[PDB]
C-alpha atoms as an extended CHARMM CRD file, in Angstrom:
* protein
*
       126  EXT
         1         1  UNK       CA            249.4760000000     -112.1630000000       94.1610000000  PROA      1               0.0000000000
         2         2  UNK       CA            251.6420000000     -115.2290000000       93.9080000000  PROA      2               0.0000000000
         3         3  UNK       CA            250.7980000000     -118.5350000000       92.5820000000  PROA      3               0.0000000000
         4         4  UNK       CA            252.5160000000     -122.4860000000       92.1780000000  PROA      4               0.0000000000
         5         5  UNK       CA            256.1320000000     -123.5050000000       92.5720000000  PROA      5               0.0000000000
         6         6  UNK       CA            255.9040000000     -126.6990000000       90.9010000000  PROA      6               0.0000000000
         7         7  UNK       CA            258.9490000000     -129.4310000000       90.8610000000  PROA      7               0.0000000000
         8         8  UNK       CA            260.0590000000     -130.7020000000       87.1900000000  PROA      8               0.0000000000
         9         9  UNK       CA            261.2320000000     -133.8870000000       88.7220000000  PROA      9               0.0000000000
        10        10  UNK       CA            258.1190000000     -134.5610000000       90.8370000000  PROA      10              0.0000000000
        11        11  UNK       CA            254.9920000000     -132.6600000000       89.0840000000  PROA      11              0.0000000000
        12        12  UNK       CA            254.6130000000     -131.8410000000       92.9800000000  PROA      12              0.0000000000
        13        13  UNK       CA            254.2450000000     -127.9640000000       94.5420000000  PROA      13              0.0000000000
        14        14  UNK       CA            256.2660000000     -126.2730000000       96.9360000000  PROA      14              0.0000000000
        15        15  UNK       CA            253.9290000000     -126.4270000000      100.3840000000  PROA      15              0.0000000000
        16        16  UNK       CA            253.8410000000     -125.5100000000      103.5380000000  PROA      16              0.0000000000
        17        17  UNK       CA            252.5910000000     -128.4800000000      105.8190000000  PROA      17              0.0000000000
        18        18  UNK       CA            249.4940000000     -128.3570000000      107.0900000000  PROA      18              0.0000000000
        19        19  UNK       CA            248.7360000000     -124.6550000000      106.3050000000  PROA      19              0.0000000000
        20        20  UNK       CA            251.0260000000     -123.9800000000      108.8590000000  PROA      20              0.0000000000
        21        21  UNK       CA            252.3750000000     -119.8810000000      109.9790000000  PROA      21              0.0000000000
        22        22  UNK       CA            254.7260000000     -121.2260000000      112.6640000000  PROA      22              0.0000000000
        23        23  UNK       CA            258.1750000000     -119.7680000000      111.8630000000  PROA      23              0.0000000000
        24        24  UNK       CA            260.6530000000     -122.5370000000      111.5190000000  PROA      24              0.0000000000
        25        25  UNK       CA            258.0570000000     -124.6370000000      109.4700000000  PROA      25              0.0000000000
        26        26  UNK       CA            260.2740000000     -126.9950000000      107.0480000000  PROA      26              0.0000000000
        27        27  UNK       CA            258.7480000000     -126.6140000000      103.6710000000  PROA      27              0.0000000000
        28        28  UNK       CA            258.4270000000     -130.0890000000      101.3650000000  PROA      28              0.0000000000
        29        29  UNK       CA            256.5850000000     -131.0130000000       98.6560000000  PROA      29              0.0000000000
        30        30  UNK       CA            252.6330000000     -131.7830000000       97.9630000000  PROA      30              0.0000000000
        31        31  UNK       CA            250.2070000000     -132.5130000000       94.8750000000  PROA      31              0.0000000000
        32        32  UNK       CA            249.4570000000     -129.2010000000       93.6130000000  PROA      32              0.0000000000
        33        33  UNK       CA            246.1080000000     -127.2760000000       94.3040000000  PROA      33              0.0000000000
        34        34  UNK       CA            244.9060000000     -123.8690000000       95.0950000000  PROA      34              0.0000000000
        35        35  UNK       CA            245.2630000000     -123.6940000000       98.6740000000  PROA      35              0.0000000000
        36        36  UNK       CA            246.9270000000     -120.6480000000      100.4510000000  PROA      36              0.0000000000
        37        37  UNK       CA            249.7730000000     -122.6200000000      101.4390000000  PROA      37              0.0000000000
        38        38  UNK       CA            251.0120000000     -123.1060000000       97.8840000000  PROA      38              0.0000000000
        39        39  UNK       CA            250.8010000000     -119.3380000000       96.5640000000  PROA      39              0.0000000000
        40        40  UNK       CA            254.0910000000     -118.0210000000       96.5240000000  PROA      40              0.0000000000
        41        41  UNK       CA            255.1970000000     -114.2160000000       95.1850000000  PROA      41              0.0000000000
        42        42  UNK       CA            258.4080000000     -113.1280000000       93.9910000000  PROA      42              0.0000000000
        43        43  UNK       CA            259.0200000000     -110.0330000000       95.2470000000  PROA      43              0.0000000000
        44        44  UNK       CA            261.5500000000     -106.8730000000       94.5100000000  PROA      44              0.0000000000
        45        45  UNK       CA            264.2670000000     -107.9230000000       97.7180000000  PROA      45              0.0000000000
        46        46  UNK       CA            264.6010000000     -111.0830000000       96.3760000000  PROA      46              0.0000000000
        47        47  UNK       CA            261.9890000000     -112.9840000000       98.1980000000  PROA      47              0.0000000000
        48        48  UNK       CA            259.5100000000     -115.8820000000       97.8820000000  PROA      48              0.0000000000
        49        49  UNK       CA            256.3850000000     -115.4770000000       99.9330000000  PROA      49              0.0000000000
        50        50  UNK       CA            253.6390000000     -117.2620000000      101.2290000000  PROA      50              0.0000000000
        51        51  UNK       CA            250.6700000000     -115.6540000000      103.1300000000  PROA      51              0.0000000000
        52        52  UNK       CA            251.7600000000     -112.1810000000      102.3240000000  PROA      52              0.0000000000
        53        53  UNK       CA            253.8660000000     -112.4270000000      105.3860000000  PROA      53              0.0000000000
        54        54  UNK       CA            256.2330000000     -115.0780000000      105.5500000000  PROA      54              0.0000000000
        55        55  UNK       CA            259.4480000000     -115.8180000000      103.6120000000  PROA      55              0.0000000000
        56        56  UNK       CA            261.1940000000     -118.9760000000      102.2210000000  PROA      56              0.0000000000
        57        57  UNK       CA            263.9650000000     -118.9860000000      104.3740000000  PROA      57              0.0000000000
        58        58  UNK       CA            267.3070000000     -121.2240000000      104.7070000000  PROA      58              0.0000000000
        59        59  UNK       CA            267.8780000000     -122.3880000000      107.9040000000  PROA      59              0.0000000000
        60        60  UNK       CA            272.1530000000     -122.4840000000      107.0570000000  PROA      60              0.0000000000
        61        61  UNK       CA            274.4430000000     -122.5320000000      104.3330000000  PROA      61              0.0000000000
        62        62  UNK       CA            275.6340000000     -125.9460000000      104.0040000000  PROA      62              0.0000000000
        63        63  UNK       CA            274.0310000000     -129.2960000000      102.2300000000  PROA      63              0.0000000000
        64        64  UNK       CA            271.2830000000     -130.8020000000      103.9270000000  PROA      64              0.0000000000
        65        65  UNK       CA            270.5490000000     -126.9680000000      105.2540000000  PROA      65              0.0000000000
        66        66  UNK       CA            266.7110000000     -126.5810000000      105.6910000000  PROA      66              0.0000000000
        67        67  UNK       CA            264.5040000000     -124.6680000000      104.1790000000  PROA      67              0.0000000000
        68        68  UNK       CA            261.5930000000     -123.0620000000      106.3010000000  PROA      68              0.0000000000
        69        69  UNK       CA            259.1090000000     -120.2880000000      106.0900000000  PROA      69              0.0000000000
        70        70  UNK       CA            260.0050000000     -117.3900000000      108.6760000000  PROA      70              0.0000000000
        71        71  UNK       CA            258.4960000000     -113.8760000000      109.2480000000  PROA      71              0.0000000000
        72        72  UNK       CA            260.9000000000     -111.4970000000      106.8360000000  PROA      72              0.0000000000
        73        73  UNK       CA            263.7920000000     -109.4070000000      108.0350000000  PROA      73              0.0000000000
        74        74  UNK       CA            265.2780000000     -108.5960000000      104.8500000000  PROA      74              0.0000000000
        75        75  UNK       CA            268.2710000000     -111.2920000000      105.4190000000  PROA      75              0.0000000000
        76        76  UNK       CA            270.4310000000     -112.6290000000      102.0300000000  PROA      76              0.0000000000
        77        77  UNK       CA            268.5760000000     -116.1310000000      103.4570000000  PROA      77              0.0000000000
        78        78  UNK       CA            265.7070000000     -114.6160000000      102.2860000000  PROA      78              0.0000000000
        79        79  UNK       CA            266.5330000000     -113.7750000000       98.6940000000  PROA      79              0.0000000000
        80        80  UNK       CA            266.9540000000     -116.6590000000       96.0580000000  PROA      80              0.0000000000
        81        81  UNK       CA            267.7990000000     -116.0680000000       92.4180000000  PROA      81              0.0000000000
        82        82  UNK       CA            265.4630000000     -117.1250000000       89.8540000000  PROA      82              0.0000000000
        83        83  UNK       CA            267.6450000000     -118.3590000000       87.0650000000  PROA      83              0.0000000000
        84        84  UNK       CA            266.0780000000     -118.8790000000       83.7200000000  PROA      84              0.0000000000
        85        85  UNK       CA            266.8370000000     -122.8410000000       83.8750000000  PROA      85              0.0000000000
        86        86  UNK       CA            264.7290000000     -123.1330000000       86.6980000000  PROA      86              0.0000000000
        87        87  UNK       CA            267.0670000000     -123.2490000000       89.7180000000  PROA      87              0.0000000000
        88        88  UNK       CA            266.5890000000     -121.1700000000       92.7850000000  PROA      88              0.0000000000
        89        89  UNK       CA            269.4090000000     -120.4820000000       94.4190000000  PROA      89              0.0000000000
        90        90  UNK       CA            269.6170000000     -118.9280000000       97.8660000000  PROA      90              0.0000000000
        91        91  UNK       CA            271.6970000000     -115.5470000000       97.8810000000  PROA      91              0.0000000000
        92        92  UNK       CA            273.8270000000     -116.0910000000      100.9070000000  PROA      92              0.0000000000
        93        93  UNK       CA            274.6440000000     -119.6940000000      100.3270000000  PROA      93              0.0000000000
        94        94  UNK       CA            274.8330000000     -120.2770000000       96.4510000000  PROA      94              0.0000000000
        95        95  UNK       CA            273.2540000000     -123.3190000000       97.0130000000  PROA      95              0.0000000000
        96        96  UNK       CA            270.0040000000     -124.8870000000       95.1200000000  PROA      96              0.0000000000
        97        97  UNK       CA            265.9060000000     -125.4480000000       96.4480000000  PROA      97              0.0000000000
        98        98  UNK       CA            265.9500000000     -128.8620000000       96.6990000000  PROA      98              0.0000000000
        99        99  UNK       CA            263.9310000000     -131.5310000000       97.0300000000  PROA      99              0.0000000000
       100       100  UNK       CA            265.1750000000     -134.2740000000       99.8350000000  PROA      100             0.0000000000
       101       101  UNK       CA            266.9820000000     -136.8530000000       98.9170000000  PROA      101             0.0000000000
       102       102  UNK       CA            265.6660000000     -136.5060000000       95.0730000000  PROA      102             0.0000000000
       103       103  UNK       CA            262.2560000000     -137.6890000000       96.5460000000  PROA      103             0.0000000000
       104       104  UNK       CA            259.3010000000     -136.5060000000       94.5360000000  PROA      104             0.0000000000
       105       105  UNK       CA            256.6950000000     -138.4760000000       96.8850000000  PROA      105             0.0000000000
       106       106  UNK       CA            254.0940000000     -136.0720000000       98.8960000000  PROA      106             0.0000000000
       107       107  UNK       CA            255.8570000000     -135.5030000000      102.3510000000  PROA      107             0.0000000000
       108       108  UNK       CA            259.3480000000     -135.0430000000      100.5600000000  PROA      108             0.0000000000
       109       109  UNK       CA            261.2190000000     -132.0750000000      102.3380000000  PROA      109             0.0000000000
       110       110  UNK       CA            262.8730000000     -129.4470000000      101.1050000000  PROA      110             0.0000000000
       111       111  UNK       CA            266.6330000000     -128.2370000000      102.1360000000  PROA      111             0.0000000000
       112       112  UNK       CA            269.7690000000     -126.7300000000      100.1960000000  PROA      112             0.0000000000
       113       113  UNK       CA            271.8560000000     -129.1160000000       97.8050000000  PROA      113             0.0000000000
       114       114  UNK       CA            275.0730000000     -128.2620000000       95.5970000000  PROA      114             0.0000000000
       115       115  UNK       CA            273.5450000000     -126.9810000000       92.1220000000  PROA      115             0.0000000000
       116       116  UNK       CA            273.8530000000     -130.3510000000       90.1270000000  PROA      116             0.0000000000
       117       117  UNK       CA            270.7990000000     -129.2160000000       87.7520000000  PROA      117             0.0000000000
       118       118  UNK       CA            268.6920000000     -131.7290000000       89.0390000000  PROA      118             0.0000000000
       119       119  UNK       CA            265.0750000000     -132.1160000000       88.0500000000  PROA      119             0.0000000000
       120       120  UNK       CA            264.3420000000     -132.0190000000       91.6680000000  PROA      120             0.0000000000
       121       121  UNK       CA            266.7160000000     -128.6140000000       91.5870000000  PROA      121             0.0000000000
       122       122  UNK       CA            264.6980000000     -127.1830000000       89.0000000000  PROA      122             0.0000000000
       123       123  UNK       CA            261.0650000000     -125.7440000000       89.4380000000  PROA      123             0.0000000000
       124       124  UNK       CA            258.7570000000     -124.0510000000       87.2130000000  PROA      124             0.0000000000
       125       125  UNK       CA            255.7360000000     -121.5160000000       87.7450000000  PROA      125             0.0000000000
       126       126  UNK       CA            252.7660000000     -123.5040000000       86.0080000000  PROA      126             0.0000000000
């Protein structure tokens, strides 16, 4: 199914640019709507994904890491933990889903960012 990742800080939805399915696509964020490219499903293993197919994906482990859509292999950079005060934190870096440079404007990408409990670290299903 899947549906919205929505940013508290931003009102803005997790998106993938342009609709794209290229692997290595940097995610950011974009006013909300019902297009495929915002319809995200928690799954089982851990994952978030989009299109049936792909999987929110960190790129690395470190700050400033980015996060991507990439066909799913079952990797821990594949699984994120979706903690009751809204963070999502990636499995094999402990790190949070977050928004750029605490930019909440359409275009703002998404990377991994020490869990501060940011309200652009903290996302909601709407």
């Amino acid at each position: 199914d899947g549906g919205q990742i929505k940013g508290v800080g931003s009102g803005r939805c997790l998106d993938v640019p342009d609709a794209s399915t290229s692997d290595g696509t940097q995610l950011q964020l974009w006013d909300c709507h019902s297009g495929t490219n915002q319809q995200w499903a928690a799954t089982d293993a851990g994952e978030l994904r989009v299109y049936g197919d792909k999987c929110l994906d960190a790129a690395g482990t470190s700050n400033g890491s980015k996060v991507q859509i990439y066909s799913c292999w079952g990797g821990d950079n594949q699984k994120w933990r979706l903690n009751s005060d809204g963070s999502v934190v990636g499995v094999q870096s402990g790190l949070c889903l977050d928004a750029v440079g605490n930019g909440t404007a359409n275009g703002t990408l998404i990377q991994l960012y020490t869990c501060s409990n940011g309200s652009n670290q903290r996302w909601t299903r709407t």
